[PDB]
């Protein structure tokens, strides 16, 4: 499509039996049955997974100013909200949307998204506990970026992170 593009370091969308999709992160829909997850039957010992949005309009990547975010997590037997949550803004070189935008780590490791030095932490405040259920609202000092992400860690007793929606928004006003 020609609008914002959701992306993730990893996604459970490889197995033909899976219905998880990274594109469900920014579709406006809050159905529990349309989620992104990085669930695996054999999870990595590194609990980290990142998911984010590349800002686009009329098919071209654009810079936006953002100061607010929304997060909607999901949980079930395998997945949950994360134990740790870092907001980051892209500060790397110019880029295009990854071909493997749901699995850049495994399938497009040369993409600049895969280099941690291309992401800068953004301090933030959330309105409630980081848990599955209600939408969580987040504020931060306004930054300019072409892409934002959340660098997350799964819980130790879970096999992945699950999300129903992720949004970034312009400052108040
Ligand atoms: Ca959604």
Numbering used by the authors: 1826 to 1998
Tell me what the authors wrote about this structure, in their words.
BgaA is specific for galactose β-1,4-linked to glucose or GlcNAc [lactose or N-acetyllactosamine (LacNAc) motifs, respectively] found in glycoconjugates. The N-terminal region of BgaA comprising amino acid residues 138–993 has amino acid sequence identity with GH family 2 enzymes. Through detailed structural and functional analyses the molecular basis for the catalytic specificity of BgaA is defined and this activity is demonstrated as critical for the ability of pneumococci to utilize complex N-linked glycans as a carbon source and protect the bacterium from opsonophagocytic killing. Further analyses also revealed the presence of non-catalytic CBMs within the C-terminal region of BgaA that mediate adherence to host cell surface LacNAc and/or lactose.
However, fold prediction using the Phyre2 server, which does not rely on amino acid sequence similarity, distinguished two regions (XII and XV) with a high probability of adopting the β-sandwich fold common to many CBMs found in CAZymes. The two predicted CBMs were recombinantly produced and the polypeptides screened for binding to all commonly occurring monosaccharides by UV difference spectroscopy; only D-galactose gave a signature UV difference spectrum consistent with sugar binding. Subsequently, this approach was expanded to the relevant galactose-containing sugars LacNAc, lactose, galactopyranosyl-β-1,3-N-acetyl-D-glucosamine (lacto-N-biose), and galactopyranosyl-β-1,3-N-acetyl-D-galactosamine [Thomsen-Freidenreich (TF) epitope] and binding was only observed to LacNAc and lactose. Significantly, the CBMs only bound with significant affinity to sugars that are substrates for the catalytic domain. A single bound metal ion was modeled as Ca2+ on the basis of coordination geometry and B-factor analysis. The shallow LacNAc binding site sits at the apex of the β-fold opposite the N- and C-termini. Tryptophan 1514 lies directly beneath the glycoside bond and coplanar with the disaccharide thus providing CH-π interactions with both pyranose rings and a higher affinity for β-linked disaccharides than for galactose alone. This binding site architecture accommodates lactose and LacNAc, but would limit the recognition of other sugars terminating in β-linked galactose.
